[PDB]
Amino acid sequence: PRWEQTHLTYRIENYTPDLPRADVDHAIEKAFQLWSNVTPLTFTKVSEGQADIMISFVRGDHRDNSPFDGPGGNLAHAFQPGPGIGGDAHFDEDERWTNNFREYNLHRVAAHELGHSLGLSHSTDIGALMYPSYTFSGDVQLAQDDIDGIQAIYGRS
Numbered sequence: 001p002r003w004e005q006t007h008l009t010y011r012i013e014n015y016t017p018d019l020p021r022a023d024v025d026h027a028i029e030k031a032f033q034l035w036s037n038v039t040p041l042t043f044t045k046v047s048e049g050q051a052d053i054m055i056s057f058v059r060g061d062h063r064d065n066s067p068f069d070g071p072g073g074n075l076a077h078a079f080q081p082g083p084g085i086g087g088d089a090h091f092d093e094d095e096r097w098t099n100n101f102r103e104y105n106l107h108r109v110a111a112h113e114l115g116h117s118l119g120l121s122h123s124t125d126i127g128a129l130m131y132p133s134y135t136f137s138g139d140v141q142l143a144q145d146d147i148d149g150i151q152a153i154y155g156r157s
């Protein structure tokens with residue numbers, strides 16, 4: 001399935017103590033801009049009511065069929081675009097998140113999780129952010145394969 005609406009809303013359930021909210025909001029807001037900058041889609045944060053995309057951080061087992069197994073395993077995951085828990089996105093909080101080319105990068109994982117909510121499947125292109133495993137690349141930018149793909153679904157800005 002896909003979102004038939006041209007506008008989407010998202011909301012953060014809570015911010016992790018690892019980093020403040022101003023820094024995390026920037027990372028999450030920046031990712032939406034990268035997708036909106038190449039697509040007529042629009043995003044808006046809501047402080048009340050249900051949001052199309054819910055973002056929250058979890059640890060160890062959190063009432064899910066895919067509990068995290070220590071720092072190894074998946075670093076994050078999300079549910080297919082659907083009602084109820086569908087569209088929700090969980091982030092592994094057992095690892096330390098940073099705001100720069102440090103060990104891990106939150107904005108980068110945020111950009112990938114959003115791609116899954118947009119209905120984008122994984123790709124085999126090295127320059128594609130939708131890399132199957134977690135790999136360190138260079139700058140965070142959308143690849144032509146991702147731009148052509150999302151644009152093909154909706155259209156060009």
Ligand SMILES: COc1ccc(S(=O)(=O)N(Cc2cccnc2)[C@@H](C(=O)NO)C(C)C)cc1
Pocket residue numbers: 073074075076077078108109112113129130131132133134135
């Ligand atoms: C920067 O983009 C990334 C975001 C998350 C990850 S992830 O390690 O959590 N992971 C990839 C994975 C791990 C182990 C075995 N098979 C697959 C999920 C994935 O591909 N998420 O996008 C998947 C298993 C739920 C990796 C890269």
Ligand SMILES: [Ca+2]
Pocket residue numbers: 068069070071072073074075092094095
């Ligand atoms: Ca992990």
Ligand SMILES: [Zn+2]
Pocket residue numbers: 058062064077090091
């Ligand atoms: Zn989870």
Ligand SMILES: [Zn+2]
Pocket residue numbers: 112116122130131132
């Ligand atoms: Zn993925």
